[PDB]
Amino acid sequence: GIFNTRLSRTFGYTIKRTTVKTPSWAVDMMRFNINDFLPPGGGSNPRSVPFEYYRIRKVKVEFWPCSPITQGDRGVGSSAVILDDNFVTKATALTYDPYVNYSSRHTITQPFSYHSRYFTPKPVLDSTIDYFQPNNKRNQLWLRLQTAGNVDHVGLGTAFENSIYDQEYNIRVTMYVQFREFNLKDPPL
Amino acid sequence: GIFNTRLSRTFGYTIKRTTVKTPSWAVDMMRFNINDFLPPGGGSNPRSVPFEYYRIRKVKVEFWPCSPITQGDRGVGSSAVILDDNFVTKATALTYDPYVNYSSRHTITQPFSYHSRYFTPKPVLDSTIDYFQPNNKRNQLWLRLQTAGNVDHVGLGTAFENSIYDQEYNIRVTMYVQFREFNLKDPPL
Amino acid sequence: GIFNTRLSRTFGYTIKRTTVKTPSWAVDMMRFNINDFLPPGGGSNPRSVPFEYYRIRKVKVEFWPCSPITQGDRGVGSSAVILDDNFVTKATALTYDPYVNYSSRHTITQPFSYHSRYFTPKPVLDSTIDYFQPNNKRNQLWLRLQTAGNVDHVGLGTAFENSIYDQEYNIRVTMYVQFREFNLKDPPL
Amino acid sequence: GIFNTRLSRTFGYTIKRTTVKTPSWAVDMMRFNINDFLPPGGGSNPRSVPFEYYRIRKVKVEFWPCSPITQGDRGVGSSAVILDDNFVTKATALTYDPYVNYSSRHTITQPFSYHSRYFTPKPVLDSTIDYFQPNNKRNQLWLRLQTAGNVDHVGLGTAFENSIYDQEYNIRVTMYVQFREFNLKDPPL
Amino acid sequence: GIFNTRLSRTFGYTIKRTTVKTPSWAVDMMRFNINDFLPPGGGSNPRSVPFEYYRIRKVKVEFWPCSPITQGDRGVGSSAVILDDNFVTKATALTYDPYVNYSSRHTITQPFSYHSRYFTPKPVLDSTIDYFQPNNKRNQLWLRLQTAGNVDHVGLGTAFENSIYDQEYNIRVTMYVQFREFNLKDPPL
Amino acid sequence: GIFNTRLSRTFGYTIKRTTVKTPSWAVDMMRFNINDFLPPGGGSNPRSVPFEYYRIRKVKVEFWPCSPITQGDRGVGSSAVILDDNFVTKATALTYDPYVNYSSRHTITQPFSYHSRYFTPKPVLDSTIDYFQPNNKRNQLWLRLQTAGNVDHVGLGTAFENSIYDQEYNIRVTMYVQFREFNLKDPPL
């Protein structure tokens, strides 16, 4: 019983100002979990979408700027796809862009420019070995939609060039999911 | 955002015994409401299936017998489709089968025989005028999936021939519904 | 169980004389109900035509004159189709023909001339909102053939030019109806 | 004004037990009249189906058993079509099956088996001469739908083999009729 | 007598400022009535457009900004189509965008960006059941153009992200209507 | 914004009796103005049909008789088309039919006979020079729909033969007009 749908979530991210003169970059990570998109249900149905299995097909991360088009001290960054839960260490002012030479690098124009990334994440099945599957719609694993313990999906790391002014963003993540085995429970009343 | 699914519900019906010698029939009615198939949800989602609109496409009423194949004093009844909320009055021992000459009559062999009816019900929009639409999948009205006040659908009346022994049935109603406009609400936690 | 038939009814209408010199018109309305065409039945069958549902397809209103061809003070009127139960107010001597500029106006030659109107009426489902369906034989609503409370159908208003002499008419309304679900009841005797 | 419909009626028949050891048969007759299917009407319409003429096209006699499938002392009988109102004399325990060598004989398995007969009856126009028409849908006579004096149609005789146990049946006769000349009368009220 | 035309109306909407730091959204509703587009007439013609019936085909809601392109604290909202008169409750600062996961969601860039929505509304025939028709130009109901009591059409709800600065808009609604039955009345003078 | 419609108006005309023995004719004129067909509006809309420009395409003058078919002293007259506002002088008993040799003469049978004339009128732009356009639908001038000062259109003159009895007529003029530039004004309320 397949049901392809779309789930979204919005949150903020700010790159604080720095008095540093050099071009330094701010590094951060981004994971994706389905608990943040799918709330708990009620009653005999533990989740709000009554299905048993799921598998995330795609994610769309949108960096919607919060800064005016008149803001100066512009910069240039990079967003890369990291499917293994080993990101570059979080840094406030690093002397280089680590994600620049990555094959999945897209340039981030800053601060007042929109940046989208559309990709297929991978689940963290074993963080010790960090193995994942290649892209195959027919062979992608089905995970279970747990009650409160779903596994973290992974796949984006960023590097933003710091500035004299604060750079704020409203980040909207949209997960395109595919469920299976409609499992609604209908007790009497 | 269409989602065709199937919702079921099971309940009992008994035709009590009678010392009457004549062939008399027991008349009863059967309505269908979506509150009995779809429970209330939890939180910002008032219902367990997160959709706004619905329209019932078909219903399958199954009379599953509870009586052995050795039971005697067998009989013959009738099930008809009544799409207007004006049934023959409920009777315990009526001297005739009212639903026998109906164009939608199917014979009910009793007591140990299975009887199915598969049809398209109609909602009770105005009980004073009792108007309904003909069968058209493209023009069928969309109703709203209310929180606790959905409208009764209608469409089956029965007539069972009484017997010296009690005739029990387990009735399983299956509604084939079609929802629209996925409306999940995801507050923070 | 469809059965298309034809039901008729005859009654009188008179436009009384007036000493008024000007050309004035007499306005009146005309509704259609099935109780006036279908009498009550007898016994377990509440109506004389044993069916459950109905829908009026067409009506033919015939103004058969009662006046000789030698009658003078002739005039000219108008008949229009009013499908919403808001007619021009009934008037004895109005200074104009209100139904003259209506798109459904047919000229009434008076007094000794025959006038027919053949159209599809509409039922009064909600007199507050006054909504009706366009002409579609496949999508026309089925109403219930009530026992003594059927709903009024609507669709004709007239304007007759007054005269020194009385203008009498014998009005024959013929409704072309379509029934469904033969529901005869045959108790013993 | 043709209207083909279907009228039904249900009643009982029992073959009482006998201590006789031999195989004996119980003979009985079966006539069909329209008064038992069509009740009287009400008012100016003397009958409940408002038509003038009729002619019976077919009849379906169904012997629905009342006995369990575990009942022993089973037997074998015969049902024949007798279109002339001269049946074999009614007998309780006759030493042979009279209807066995008839060209229209169908075997009746007893007691817990269903038996149907579908045929075209004939009216009793003259019982002295006992003449009837062959089967022709285009040339079949139209009779009048009388008020309380309709003519008996004929066409089935049976022979049931007696048993130590009582053999009960619920007999459902269905007549497929064809009316003509819709004659509804609509007085005022 | 069909006459397709276009009626417009302009009014203001402001999202007041908030000291709240979080991303909160301001929710509001939008209904459409023809009294606000069609004024009352004069004399025997109760309305200024001399027709009897109407049906709204489309509506174009245009959010024309009032704010400069240099305004900061930009945001992102959502506009959805709600054809049933049950909107999300009006809120000043709600912690999420309720209309974000709706199938009819269009993103609203704020504050200095134009937003249009072009859709087919539905009338509020029964607010208790909240039923409406699907889109069909040939089967759309004709309503009556009442004098001062027309029914509210429905179909848009919004969610605007709050800001430190006031966000003003000039909203221009354009209804594309279709009238019927020219009913001009011409008394003497 | 073109809108072709039809506007009508009804009034009386009588040819009084004369004791004169000779055949004499009664001459009269007939002009057409849109103020007599289109009433004043209400509010910001000065007219009841909300358009700016107009041009009269055709006029249908119908002489509907008021006299019985038994009336004697019958006669013969003439109706001609006069597109320049210089009619034959109005006369009570003229010794000849002036409009008889006109190229646009149609015979008027009197008194109990219907007479129609269907033609294209012309406006009185300059009564001193009396110039008009030939018939061309594409090149016909657009006039302005004034508030209370519209220009007179012209085009019919008649000659009725007098009689011992009074000859009355009900004259119905129908103008087929074509408007342009829908100009409805919708202030608030």
UniProtKB/TrEMBL annotation, chains A, B, C, D, E, F:
| GO terms for MF | DNA binding
Q: Which residues of the full protein are shown?
A: 43 to 231 of 233
Q: Does DNA-binding appear among the keywords?
A: yes
Q: What is this protein called?
A: Cap
Major location, coarse class? Answer: host cell
Q: Which domain of life is it from?
A: Viruses
Key words, A-Z: Capsid protein, DNA-binding, Host nucleus, Host-virus interaction, T=1 icosahedral capsid protein, Viral attachment to host cell, Viral penetration into host cytoplasm, Viral penetration into host nucleus, Virion, Virus endocytosis by host, Virus entry into host cell
Listed GO CC annotations: host cell; host cell nucleus; T=1 icosahedral viral capsid
